[PDB]
Amino acid sequence: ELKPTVILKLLKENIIQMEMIENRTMDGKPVSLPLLYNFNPDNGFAPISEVMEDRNQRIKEMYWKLWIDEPFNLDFDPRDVIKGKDFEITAKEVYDFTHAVGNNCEDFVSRPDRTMLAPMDFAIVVGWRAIIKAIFPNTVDGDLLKLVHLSNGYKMIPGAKPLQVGDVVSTTAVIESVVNQPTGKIVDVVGTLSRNGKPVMEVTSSFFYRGNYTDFENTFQKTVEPVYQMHIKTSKDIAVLRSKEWFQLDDEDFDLLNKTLTFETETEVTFKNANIFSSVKCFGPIKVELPTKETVEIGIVDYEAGASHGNPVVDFLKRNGSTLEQKVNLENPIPIAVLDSYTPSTNEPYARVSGDLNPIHVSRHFASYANLPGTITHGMFSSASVRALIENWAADSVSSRVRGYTCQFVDMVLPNTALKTSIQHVGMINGRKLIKFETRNEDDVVVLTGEAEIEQPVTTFVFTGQGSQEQGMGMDLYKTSKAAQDVWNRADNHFKDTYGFSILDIVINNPVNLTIHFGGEKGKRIRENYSAMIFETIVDGKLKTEKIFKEINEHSTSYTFRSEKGLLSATQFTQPALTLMEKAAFEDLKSKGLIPADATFAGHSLGEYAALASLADVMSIESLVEVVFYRGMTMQVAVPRDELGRSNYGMIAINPGRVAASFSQEALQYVVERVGKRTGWLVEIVNYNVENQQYVAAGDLRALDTVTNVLNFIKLQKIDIIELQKSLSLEEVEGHLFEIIDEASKKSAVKPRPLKLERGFACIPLVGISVPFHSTYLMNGVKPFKSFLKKNIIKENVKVARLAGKYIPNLTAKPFQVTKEYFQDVYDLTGSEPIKEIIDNWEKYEQ
Amino acid sequence: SIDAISQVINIAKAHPNFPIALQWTGGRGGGHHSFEDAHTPMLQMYSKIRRHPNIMLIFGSGFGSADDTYPYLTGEWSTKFDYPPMPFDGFLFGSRVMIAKEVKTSPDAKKCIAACTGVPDDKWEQTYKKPTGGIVTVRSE
Amino acid sequence: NILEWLENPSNTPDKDYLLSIPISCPLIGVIQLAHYVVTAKLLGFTPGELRSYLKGATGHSQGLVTAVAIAETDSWESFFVSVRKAITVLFFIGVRCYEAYPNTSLPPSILEDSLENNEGVPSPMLSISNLTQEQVQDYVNKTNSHLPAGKQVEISLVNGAKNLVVSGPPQSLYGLNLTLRKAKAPSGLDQSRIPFSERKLKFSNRFLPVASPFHSHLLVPASDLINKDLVKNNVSFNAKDIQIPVYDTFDGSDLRVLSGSISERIVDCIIRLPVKWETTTQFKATHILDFGPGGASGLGVLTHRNKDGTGVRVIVAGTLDINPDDDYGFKQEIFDVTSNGLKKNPNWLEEYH
Amino acid sequence: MKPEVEQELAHILLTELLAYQFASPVRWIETQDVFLKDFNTERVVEIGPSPTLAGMAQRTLKNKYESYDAALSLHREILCYSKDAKEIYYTPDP
């Protein structure tokens, strides 16, 4: 329908007035901008001149009535926090917004038996009033009609779930930087949408008042400096650092020598002139790397200066350090898609959902007065519109995955323009895919450009156990990756200096034999570390401890490790080699920014140490190779041995499938438990690897030879035990195979000393293994290791969240939780004093 | 074969005024063989076969009496498979005749042929593996 | 703006827009009504005069509506309120069923895979061919095993013997599609040297050109709402007014022999209840006339291949083309004066008695 | 519960699990089922010399997740650091 848009008349004292009217308002009641012009017939050539005084104020007043549901007060300190309003997300406000920007994601559409989710885009609808208020104060005097939007982004605070339809949202805007530039005034605002006390996401907008400003007294800038890493190598290095008054650590006595420092700095600046700063603050924590690679606060950067000209602290750290950037590029950008988009026929739809009643976008006479190409499409529209594309095609329409998005409004777009926007995968950051996009119009002009961080698919890391170690394994990666070198070298050094061998050598060229030489003063230092290898054995209260290295004593000149094949396949070396290769590889992945935050992990026997080390940094690189190395010496020693060093035990790898299609897991369990009790020997199922396919049993070689033969029988006999269990009684089939057992058990007991296990129909002997580990046989060797572990896995390196819910042990097969519930299951599977007390008095709750 | 039948249909359009006896044999026949079912192909091709007046459709293989053969004449056979009545124009008897007084089949051989217990179409597939009703498949040179 | 799109093809929206139900339901009906009219007008009949020659009528899915409305028809002056009833029903079916379950972005990864596996572009209705109704229901029962109530798929159409149509959310129908993808066999497998019994299932399956899950639990919500709406406008179908049998989609019965509302039935018959097409085409006749959408790709030919040998002769009323087989007939027969316009399909039982 | 207290506890639990892992058997079947089904991993990555635990998790999928995967339309991807560098580091050919 038709309506008044402009009203032109005279006023008192020769003042032309152009009433500029906007009909689309907050309450239906038209608002008006009073434009005033001095008519003066004494200047025939330029009669009309504009009344400039309070011009900005009139424009601001009209924008206020359209944006702000509050009283017109232009008297904020720009420095004061702006509180927003609480905001309940209605089901329908979402419907309207999604449809306005064109986001057809199913996460936002009401479906049966699912709560409706709100688009991260919706943050702007919530915070718009809190944010926009920030460019209004008198001390930031702009012409709102020449206002320009530069950028806007959303950042999700980690751990925060996305906005939902239920949520009530508190909004807070602060204004981070306001700086006068050559070309105009720039205001950087930050929103923080919180929910239920906790902060949920941050919104960033920067606006631009074009023009010439001298406002310097009302200008300020905060910036978050990148983290600077500094490798204190020499003695003068530490001297120069102590020379600066801003370098201020807690204990001055701290040994900086040979540590690595990080400087997490924020610099707050206030201008007083064109180029000269009025004041420069620069503060932040100084941190030191631990062996775990964790970082602990050591002190402070505390700089302060008036009438500055530059930032000395940052300049120092620039030249005297390196700059850690968390973004890591891929090798080549990977194209994702190029997509066709359109701007809306009218802008009213977006304006209604968003609360941006800015006439520039809706009323042609305002657009034209500001000298725009027409009724420009809401930049904010294209933000959400393009974002939708990234959401669909880059995150496979999993709303959840995009956790960061940002947008630069390069140029303007009119309604009914077509927009090819293209999207590539450019790099990684902290496990998230870094995605860059660029949107051009029909005239091939760039109009939009931003980036997005997108979560990787649900990832689980599994760390390999022994058995597959190859000579030279992961030695290629040692040659290319820095992360790798550091891991290996730290370890190789520790091994050289405490046991007198190189784990790199062993891996690089599998040595048939290897002798340690206890040479000079360092030779003798080494051999004591060999001489203190203890294997404790709690047997009925008694602690039977023995030297692991029998022969190394005060008169030994050397020891020698032996292996006919090659020492890389002797577990004491195998284990470090594996743990090392893996920990190195993972740390390269971590360095390329490829490790998802919420990734779950588990390791298989040995790999569980590598897994704990890699994902949770529970121990130093050296602590790892140590623990793992002793774990191997331990295994080598817990079984009685021959002259030729033979074993009374071994392991058999079974496949219930090959015996009979009928032969289940309960059937293999049953069969092995009977041959266990019957022969009074030792067989237990040690590896539960693949259901109905891959199992491993260990124990008495004789018991292994019975089970392997009992099995062979049941196959050629076609004995469905699930069926005989129905037709006969427990005692009936029990005895039935007790007889089968007893005819095979005779045969193997009558066999020579260290029986040679041979192949079966579903049984394969695991050549190599001699210890019945992962059986009960090693329960006595627990409490000497349980102290060894406690001496190497310090309390302070166990950060709970790194493990909770993500770490799948092997004892338990259930995700690490520090709950009464969990603690009990462990006791049940093990019976341990330390645990039992804890379960028993769980109410140690309060400090 | 289903394709083979479709071939005959084409030889049929070839000379629409010429009588062509389409002897549809099955897989359960004597001598030369086929991995094909006796009902599926016919059940499937019948409508097309029947739009050519020059085609005289003849069901063969597995027949021995007027009695088992009758339903294929009524067209009632095709009913077991929820299909419209599908009547045939004639029947051939290959095995059934091998005992007749006037075939040259030797005495001891006629005796051998008789004493073979048959087997329903239900279980002819077993010729490929075991002797089935005293009859196996075997491959020519 | 239907009139606009017609005049300036340039202005016609995407197939994607045209296909979504709220506009596609009513339009399809107009197409059918329009076909009825060229047949009636061109024969020299009134709407009702045409209707009198009919032993009865029936629709498939949303086609039921126009069949009901067609039989309520008498004279040209009166023809238009009959049109109003039909399309104002379709309009509400469309608008309300869309609102109930509106299409949402397909994860491009799925669309990608479903495409390089020669299946369709994922939609709410999948069609499986050469599988038992039992066989099909088996695979769906398995698929549904792993899904929540609101994501489950059911049989929508039993269009025929081994021809079915499952329906539900596109993504869960895609899941059924995967479980099927392993159970089948490459089309040119040549199992000609494999004994019959021992061979592998060959079968076809594709998504259908539709925006909505018809005949599924996804739409039940819009049932009561549509009817509440149908009452708020003039629309209702009294059994008094329908002049010829209108065979129920599920029963196969007449809609006139009905205690309750006939409107409410055909609403629930399109929105919630399956279509047992063969049982709903129980009747016996010489000739079936197809006024419904889509030339020889339409309902006529489907029903024809159901009946083949039984002397029923389908005629596609909306397309002037040519059948090389004379399998069925096209638009022409409905109007021909020669004995060439009276063709009948064979009944093998009689022909070859 | 107090943060420092949680550590102290969680610590000894961690050391317990590691000490006794020595004797108790390796419940890998149960484990795979935790991350395969409870977590619904789409990228399970094996970090080792060769692809042993991978083909383990692969067999497990064919043996048990045949149907689950299909219906729930979840594409799973099983990668070994050993052999699938391209796919882990996101660096392909043309």
Ligand SMILES: Cc1cc2nc3c(=O)[nH]c(=O)nc-3n(C[C@H](O)[C@H](O)[C@H](O)COP(=O)(O)O)c2cc1C
């Ligand atoms: C001993 C014997 C010899 C045959 N010789 C021929 C032949 O030379 N040419 C041919 O087209 N079919 C030949 N057949 C196939 C039969 O003509 C007919 O197709 C088949 O036997 C019918 O199957 P039935 O014996 O079960 O009724 C022969 C079948 C048998 C049992």
